[model samples]
Target: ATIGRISTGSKSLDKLLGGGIETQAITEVFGEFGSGKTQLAHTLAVMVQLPPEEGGLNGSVMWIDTENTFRPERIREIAQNRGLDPDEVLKHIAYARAFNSNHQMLLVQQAEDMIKELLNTDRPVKLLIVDSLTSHFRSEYIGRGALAERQQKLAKHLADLHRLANLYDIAVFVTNQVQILAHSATLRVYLRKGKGGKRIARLIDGEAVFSITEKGIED
Candidate 1:
């Protein structure tokens, strides 16, 4: 099947991503706390509502919030610039606040049903986000004794994600998780601070330069 791609919310970033982020595979944006990963996620949520000519997929986003960072205020600001109705754009997003790591895994199963609900509609679910995908794992499964168990569970969760993405051709964006996912996730973007308040996305081939603004990511 041909790959599905959508903008990373910045023309500069989109250029570096070889057009845009690809669907049917997992894309990890790695960064320290507050390094603009969530902001980028918000950017995509709004952009996905746009037509493909604008680098959007015209699809809906299912965001699984692990850190309570999913805000409609940011989405509205981003939407305002896209010539799309902020109120209408907000309606397309399906959000779920995960209670725990176990519940987080459970939510993916729940996502399957949501994905199906929109399957035949004009805007099928095309994007899925597990924001701060690794935060809960680190906090809930502490101690060296739990490391192996944590890794095992994380692997299964990722496998489930892989199944969901491949089977449905949906794009999955997760914010950080390295070793356990090193072999699974196909695309990785490491976000870091840059000069003049810019953010750099370091993937395999090279780096992408962009900035986070009120509207969304910019050149």
Candidate 2:
């Protein structure tokens, strides 16, 4: 099985990334708190559901909300504003709130089960979205001493998602939180790509670049 690529649903972004997201790979979007990472996820949710003729793939979305930031109302409004069928489109997607670090991991496992079930019925998941992937990894492991253990667990979780992407041929999109860098001369957010990132980056075949928009994402 090959990797499932990620498509930003934005032509400019897809073109900039040299084509689109890699299949069965995890594409991480990292930025500050106010950045449009989440908004991008919302946009993709609706955009992907749109048929190719309407600039979409007409696929279903699976969202893992780590911090309870999955807002269906906002998406509904966005969908309506975009002239899409808000009701039908929103209904096609699924959401789950991760209780804890362990729950977050198991959620993906359960999703795999559901995906398998759905695949048998002919309707398969076209995309997987995680609003923020770093919170649990950062909160679960407090100090530097637990860094290795934390990363190991995070790596395992990413591996599972990578497999789902390949097995089902769906795009996997993950939103990442950025760490502050006061020492750097330029105002830039750096992603900690040691373990969690390494697992996804290696698995993801496409490229990702940092983007900052004023009116779109807030920060």
Give the TM-scores of the predictions, in the order they appear: 0.94, 0.77
Please list the residue runs of candidate 1 whose C-alpha ends up more than 4 Å from where it truly belongs after superposition: 177-183
Clashes of 2: 10
lDDT string, candidate 2, 1-219, tens digits: 554334455555555445555545566766566546776778777766666566455578889999888888767876776677778778878899987789889999999877876774434677888767778878878876787787778888888887887788777788777642111111112232233222112112242333323211111
When summed lDDT is taken over every stretch of 10 residues in candidate 1, the lowest stretch is 177-186
Q: After superposition, how far is residue 120 of candidate 2 from its true place, in Å?
A: 5.1
lDDT against the true structure, per candidate, is: 0.86, 0.64
For model 1 the local lDDT of residue 48 reads 80
Model 2: clashing residue pairs? Answer: 3-23, 3-24, 4-22, 4-23, 4-24, 5-21, 5-22, 5-23, 6-21, 6-22
